[PDB]
């Protein structure tokens, strides 16, 4: 109390003041923009939702004693807000109760009164007209309530709060979404409640119970129209079915719901991660690595974020399933130190023709390979141990004797050198050909890639994308 | 104090890291270490060398004497003589830190330099201290101090005085050769070789010529290399002193490739005796070996690697394996062959070169306006 | 040293003489504008970053 207790009065009141006026001006601003000029995609909806991912998770973790978040429940226990006097009565109460919680002690939430902080705030004439207010101020008290992590009769405090909030969401979904479309708000609300309800089903039994309900929310999605609702629920529905290590992937191959068609640069980024995971395991290697490449370069705007460490981890494997390998560890992180040492020393052995070192890597770093969800490399990367050099030779040489290629690939027999090169050309490693008469493996024709109509194909791709930006820009620019 | 000092940092390297090399460095360092009053840094250097000898307490009281003899000078000075700035308190207390740079470690010297930097008002005395920080950052190759004060030398100082910056031009590319920047920034401002006397600010001349002739044949192949280093005459004086260096030049320019390897063999082994050496040797030779190949495959388009067996060196299979490693490296734009034994080349045309650059820069700006169009419109 | 427009062959001992294409100018003037257009997108990149 003389050391830290004197610096206990400054942390409540300024987050009680100006952080309160954030959602007070936003929730006032989002409501009036839901009333008039209802197409508010170009408004404060997005960045406030970018804040609720980032800011309010690190603005507060505990329920903020001396009445900053512990005071939110005696603040919003009494909200009528129904008619224009009932709002202006409560606008006086927004002045009164915030002043009382800024001065003195209201109902102090000592981590236990959460269900009477879900009835009586929802009671005392709380509206479904302010269903964004009930939607936000039920999803935001998940975050002091989960991140306490004491988990002692709080799992049901999670469970009741989500079912209250989603029954409010269902009551929106059937009754009068008059020019509002709370799906923009309630998508990440459906996500954030079910990131941790997934975590609840990590501490306890399996989470196909989530997936049956998540089909039902996706069944009521896609029927109205798609405005990010199908997009957010699809990545959620895919994740457990990929997280389970059963068969599980032909369900996604038949999942013909491939189109969100616009995803605000962030759903589309990790959507391409999960479908790249799928196309890699069913041996469609070349299409997988190029959409893994598209996923890697789409959201790098982060700070050592860890899933960037994951997409970078898979992409080097699938290109080691194609022979080529780039520089990888040139952007070393405080966490990449753990993940560079296996895979750089892995491809060190892949480029060489060594195998007793390669099996030494497997015994050294099998636990991390099993932890990363990549058991399958040992059955599929031993293929490209011979396919790396034969692509390297057919890139270097032009007309090789197959007798000479056996010692150069240390194949220890000249007669099966027909068969590997037959496997290379039938699968399309190199466009070369064999003369089965005196040992020739001769290469392609002369390079003719300017006067043979091929520059027109790439030039048509760049027309069809660049002026497509032009037409999409002119429509999107002039709203007034 | 600091002026002949950098040869010591050569013998710190040469004695230590080649463990076989423990014969001749200690023969002319220890007799130089009992001289010059060198007392603080050599304790770890005596650990890696032969273990101990009792001259430590001999010069300990002698380094304490000249510490105290000039400490009592400038404390009596500041208590009797009442000028400040660049006063007698100034040049006595910089003589304390220059007693530290010659004798002590860096840490007492650098904090006395920062103590005396804010007591100055003239930029010439400021820059001479920044000369000292750059040299002591070059003693111990500490890459943190040298990046800072060079910006201090550029921005905060050298909008004033003049032609004490060419002394630090040789230090800007002393940084670039100890870095991997062996390519263009070193050879560009090494090219003004008109700085002659082997001073503190010009640490050597003849080895400076060898430094700027080794780095020179990577910056440029023939966009008139021959005017700046071969038609250059003031460079041609002192490479007339060194016959092996001049032979290394003219073998490459007059296309004598067999004696070029014998010259390049001596260079790489002679490079081993250097203290800014770590970026050079594994990268320098392989860049020059692929440099000689590229111009030799030029002027031919049907070469046979049997002609490499005598016009070039020997080793039919040696040329075969080294071209194979370099074609697979993405460099050395030609196509090696087996049983025909004809090194055919393939170089692009104008249009086949220009089409590749426009499709690389095209997709770069296309991706650039992909992301920008997604930042706007939510 | 570009005194001559030809090429040699070791496998034939045969000198071959050809010419040069001077039509580089259109593609050369094209890709210099991309260096200009790369900077104007960077100019609009931080213009949207400074204020939304």
């Amino acid at each position: 109390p003389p050391g830290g207790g004197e610096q206990e009065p400054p942390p409540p009141p300024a987050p009680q003041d100006v952080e309160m006026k954030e959602e007070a001006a936003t929730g006032g601003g989002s409501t009036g923009e839901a009333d008039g000029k209802t197409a508010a995609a170009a408004a404060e909806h997005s960045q406030r939702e970018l804040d609720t991912v980032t800011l309010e998770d690190i603005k507060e973790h505990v329920k903020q004693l001396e009445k900053a978040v512990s005071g939110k429940e005696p603040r919003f226990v009494l909200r009528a807000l129904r008619m224009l006097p009932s709002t202006s009565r409560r606008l006086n109460h927004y002045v009164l109760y915030k002043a009382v919680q800024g001065f003195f002690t209201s109902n102090n939430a000592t981590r236990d009164f959460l269900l009477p902080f879900l009835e009586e705030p929802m009671d005392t004439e709380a509206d479904l007209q302010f269903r964004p207010r009930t939607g936000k101020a039920a999803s935001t008290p998940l975050l002091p309530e989960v991140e306490a992590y004491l988990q002692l009769l709080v799992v049901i405090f999670m469970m009741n709060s989500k079912r209250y909030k989603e029954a409010q969401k269902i009551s929106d979904d059937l009754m009068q979404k008059i020019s509002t479309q709370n799906r923009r708000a309630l998508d990440l609300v459906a996500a954030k409640c079910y990131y941790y309800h997934a975590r609840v089903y990590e501490f306890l039994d399996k989470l196909d119970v989530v997936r049956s309900f998540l089909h039902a929310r996706l069944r009521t999605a896609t029927l109205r129209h798609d405005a990010d609702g199908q997009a957010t629920l699809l990545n959620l529905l895919l994740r457990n079915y990929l997280h389970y290590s059963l068969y599980d992937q032909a369900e996604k191959l038949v999942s013909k719901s491939v189109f969100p068609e616009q995803a605000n640069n962030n759903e589309w980024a990790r959507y391409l991660y999960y479908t790249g995971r799928i196309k890699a395991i069913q041996l469609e290697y070349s299409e997988a690595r190029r959409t893994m490449t598209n996923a890697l370069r789409k959201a790098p705007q982060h700070t050592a974020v860890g899933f960037k460490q994951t997409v970078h981890k898979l992409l080097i494997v699938v290109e080691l399933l194609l022979g080529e390998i780039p520089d990888r560890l040139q952007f070393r992180q405080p966490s990449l130190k753990r993940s560079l040492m296996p895979y750089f020393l892995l491809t060190q052995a892949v480029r060489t023709g060594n195998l007793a070192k390669f099996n030494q890597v497997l015994d050294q770093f099998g636990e991390k390979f099993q932890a990363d969800g990549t058991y399958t490399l040992i059955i599929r990367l031993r293929h490209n141990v011979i396919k790396t050099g034969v692509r390297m030779i057919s890139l270097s040489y032009s007309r090789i004797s197959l007798a000479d290629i056996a010692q150069k690939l240390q194949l220890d027999s000249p007669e099966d050198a027909e068969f590997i090169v037959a496997k290379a050309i039938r699968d399309g490693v190199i466009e070369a050909s064999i003369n089965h008469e005196k040992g020739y493996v001769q290469s392609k024709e002369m390079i003719d890639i300017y006067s043979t109509r091929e520059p027109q194909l790439a030039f048509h791709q760049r027309i069809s994308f660049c002026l497509d930006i032009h037409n999409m820009s002119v429509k999107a620019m002039r709203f007034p | 104090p600091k002026n002949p000092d950098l040869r010591i940092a050569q013998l710190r390297f040469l004695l230590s890291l080649p463990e076989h090399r423990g014969d001749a460095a200690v023969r002319d360092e220890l007799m130089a270490a009992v001289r010059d009053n060198n007392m603080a840094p050599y304790y770890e250097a005596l650990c890696k060398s032969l273990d101990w000898q009792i001259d430590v307490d001999l010069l300990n009281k002698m380094k304490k004497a000249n510490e105290d003899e000039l400490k009592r000078l400038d404390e009596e000075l500041e208590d009797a003589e009442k000028n400040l700035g660049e006063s007698e308190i100034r040049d006595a207390m910089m003589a304390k830190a220059e007693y530290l740079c010659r004798i002590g470690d860096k840490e007492g010297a650098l904090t006395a330099f920062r103590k005396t930097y804010d007591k100055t008002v003239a930029l010439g005395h400021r820059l001479d201290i920044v000369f000292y920080l750059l040299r002591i950052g070059l003693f111990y190759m500490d890459n943190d101090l040298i990046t800072r004060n060079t910006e201090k030398a550029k921005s905060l100082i050298e909008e004033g005085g003049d032609w004490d910056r060419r002394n630090r031009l040789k230090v800007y590319q002393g940084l670039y050769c100890v870095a991997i920047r062996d390519f263009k920034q070193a050879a560009e401002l090494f090219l003004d070789t008109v700085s002659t006397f082997t001073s503190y600010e010009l640490m050597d001349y003849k080895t400076f010529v060898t430094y700027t002739v080794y780095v020179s044949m990577i910056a440029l192949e023939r966009p008139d290399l021959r005017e700046k280093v071969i038609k250059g005459a003031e460079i041609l004086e002192v490479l007339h002193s060194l016959p092996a260096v001049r032979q290394y030049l003219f073998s490459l320019y007059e296309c004598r490739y067999s004696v070029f390897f014998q010259s390049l063999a001596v260079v790489e082994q002679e490079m081993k005796k250097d203290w800014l050496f770590a970026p050079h040797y594994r990268y320098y030779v392989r860049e020059m070996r692929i440099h000689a190949y590229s111009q030799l495959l030029e002027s031919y388009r049907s070469l046979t690697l049997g002609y490499m067996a005598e016009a070039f060196g020997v080793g039919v299979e040696f040329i075969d394996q080294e071209l194979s490693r370099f074609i697979a490296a993405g460099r050395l734009h030609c196509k090696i062959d087996k049983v025909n034994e004809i090194v055919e080349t393939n170089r692009p045309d104008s249009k086949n070169w220009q089409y590749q650059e426009t499709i690389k820069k095209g997709d770069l700006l296309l991706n650039r306006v992909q992301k920008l169009s997604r930042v706007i419109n939510m | 040293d570009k005194k001559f427009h030809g090429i040699l062959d070791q496998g034939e001992g045969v000198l071959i003489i050809f010419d040069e294409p001077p039509v580089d100018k259109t593609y050369e003037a094209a890709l210099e504008t991309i260096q200009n257009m790369s900077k104007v997108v960077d100019s609009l990149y931080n213009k949207a970053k400074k204020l939304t």
Partner: peptide
């Protein structure tokens, strides 16, 4: 590359010039 790109960037310039001048009159009405 010369006509489709440059016409797009000009129309992209009209995006930011509109959206700045839109909301700065919006947030400064009251």
């Amino acid at each position: 590359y010369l006509a489709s790109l440059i016409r797009s960037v000009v129309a992209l310039h009209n995006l930011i010039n509109n959206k700045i001048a839109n909301r700065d009159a919006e947030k400064k009405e009251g």
